[PDB]
Amino acid sequence: VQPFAWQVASLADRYEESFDIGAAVEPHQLNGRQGKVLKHHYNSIVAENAMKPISLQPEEGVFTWDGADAIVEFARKNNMNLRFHTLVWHNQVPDWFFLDEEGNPMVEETNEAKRQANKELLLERLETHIKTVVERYKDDVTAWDVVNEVVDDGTPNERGLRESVWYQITGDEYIRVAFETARKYAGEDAKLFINDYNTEVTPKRDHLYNLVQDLLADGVPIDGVGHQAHIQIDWPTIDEIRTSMEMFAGLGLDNQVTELDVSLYGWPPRPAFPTYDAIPQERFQAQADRYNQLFELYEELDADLSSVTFWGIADNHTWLDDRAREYNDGVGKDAPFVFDPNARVKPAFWRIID
Ligand SMILES: [Mg+2]
Ligand code: NA
């Protein structure tokens, strides 16, 4: 029987000279159970869902601050830093953004002058969204995921940009405008990030690299890269992770690990064990070795890495379960964190606290 998360040394304290230790949270978890873990181990939080575009402005001019406000009040009360996720994304984003003045989707407009008008309108809606959100949470947010996942996993164009509605309408102008607007209202010391998954993987890594390089050359204020780090036990390699972070540091950018989880499975995540109890200890041990190697790298690169956030707290709640179930006919349990479903420590915790 492993000790509870509150009965062991703090992760935040352990890595105090190196980087923040973070967790993704929902409002329902800011009660005692998961609150005891959070206060003990973490000095930074992020909203798992409550600060995404549709979570804040579901309809034009109607704002839903309550979930986000609760998360911010917890950050304040418990003296935690706060990453904002996220100002721009092609998912969890409300439809009204992309409808023209006549209520029709902007993508199905052909007259080029009207497209130009719709592009301007879309950029102005974006700007007002960012303006409003930033003016509210300016003095609480310590890092901004300004745009999320704007680089494609393949190569549908030579710049490797994701061809979402944002891109279909504006090209890369939404990225520029997102950053420009956030700098403008958040201030000069606000740390503005571009966040993505598979930042360690070529060709995507090089497309991301080239993108931030082009925008920096045009004076677009990007202070850092967010590495989501939705990784596996043996993928990506430690050297691929290292190489990516070194590359972005060499552009004078900061690195942050933003959504870390160490899945027990490959991609796609099958076969998955049906339940937590059915997962063999063997697999938790392979996970612990991986974590040890991960955090030695992170600590080695602490000059260039300011924050390491896990995308959840304990193994009872993780979006990786959705993915497991998806690929195993509705049955699947992953276990990506250093704390188990009853908030007891796992082998992985011991390998990163030492
Ligand atoms: Mg270790
Ligand atoms: Na650091």
Side-chain angles (χ1 to χ4, degrees), residues 17-19 302-306:
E17 309 310 324
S18 273
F19 33 72
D302 57 359
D304 308 308
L305 174 64
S306 56

Side-chain angles (χ1 to χ4, degrees), residues 70-124:
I71 287 166
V72 173
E73 283 163 38
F74 187 87
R76 284 183 185 195
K77 194 192 169 194
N78 297 294
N79 210 92
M80 267 146 188
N81 291 355
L82 175 70
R83 307 195 75 265
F84 186 95
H85 183 76
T86 175
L87 299 174
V88 179
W89 195 30
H90 65 280
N91 287 326
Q92 285 171 283
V93 65
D95 289 1
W96 67 265
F97 270 128
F98 315 104
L99 296 176
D100 65 24
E101 213 64 51
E102 310 187 73
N104 290 322
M106 293 169 172
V107 298
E108 59 179 279
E109 169 58 78
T110 51
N111 179 278
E112 286 293 348
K114 292 217 273 155
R115 289 186 59 76
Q116 262 295 315
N118 292 331
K119 173 189 216 208
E120 277 164 57
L121 181 55
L122 178 50
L123 290 175
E124 295 170 351

Side-chain angles (χ1 to χ4, degrees), residues 262 287-295 310 336-338 348 352:
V262 173
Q287 185 182 43
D289 276 304
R290 166 59 142 179
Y291 263 116
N292 174 55
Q293 294 171 48
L294 267 177
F295 277 71
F310 295 95
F337 305 124
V338 304
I352 70 161

